[PDB]
RNA sequence: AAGGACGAGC
């Protein structure tokens, strides 16, 4: 478990929040190997966000299942840290409840996706996409969860073995565009 | 949406 699999961005922090209270707070779900509140170099004031890193991906998952999170009188806004290498890429920092899944071919059905994806989180809807004219399966689908974190969690692995296929998953982007 | 670490002349 490389650090980017165990690291959370924390947004919406009180400007009073320090590394200490961030650490105290998040250590109820485990050991932290790193913790920072980001500060303005000139004024030394909190920029309103920080990062925490747990020792195991188990602990991140327990923290994020354990939401919402309040610290210093504010509900904060945690999200899995997108790899630095990915900054500047299209949709890198997008936050969405909907997953694109491609490479599922013409034999994959709602239940195949429901079976595979349900232990990541609560699924609201599964859409297996068909041609409007033929009704043939187009080889891709979308899964919509009740929260963004299953999506964020799922896409840290690019390929998923679903119904005998090595499917690629991505954050669902708007049509719209795209 | 990045300070550190990974990797500062160790």
Author numbering: 16 to 193
Text lifted from the article:
As a core component of the hnRNP complex in mammalian cells, hnRNP A2/B1 is an abundant protein and has been implicated in numerous biological processes. The B1 isoform contains an insertion of 12 amino acids (aa) at its N terminus. Both isoforms have an RNA-binding domain (RBD) composed of tandem RRMs separated by a 15-aa linker, and a C-terminal Gly-rich low complexity (LC) region that includes a prion-like domain (PrLD), an RGG box, and a PY-motif containing a M9 nuclear localization signal (PY-NLS). Here, we determined the crystal structures of the tandem RRMs of hnRNP A2/B1 in complex with various RNA substrates, revealing the molecular details of specific target RNA recognition and shedding light on the mechanism for hnRNP A2/B1 in various RNA-mediated biological functions. The two RRM domains in hnRNP A2/B1 interact with each other extensively in a fixed antiparallel orientation, and the binding surfaces of RRM1 and RRM2 align in the same plane, which forces hnRNP A2/B1 to bind two antiparallel RNA strands or a single-stranded RNA with a long connecting loop.
In order to understand the molecular basis for hnRNP A2/B1 recognizing different RNA sequences, we grew the crystals of hnRNP A2/B1 (aa 12–195) in complex with different 10mer RNA mutants. Three complex structures containing RNA mutants A1G, U6G, and A7U were determined at high resolution. In contrast, hnRNP A2/B1 adopts distinct strategies for binding another two RNAs that contained mutations in the UAG motif recognized by RRM2. Interestingly, the recognition of AAGG by RRM1 is exactly same as AGGG in the A1G RNA mutant, though their binding modes of AG motif are different, suggesting that RRM1 can accommodate various purine-rich sequences. Moreover, two hnRNP A2/B1 proteins bound to same RNA strands can adopt various orientations, as seen in the structures of the 10mer RNA and the two 10mer RNA mutants A1G and U6G. These diverse orientations are mainly due to the absence of direct interactions between the RRM domains bound to the same RNA strands.
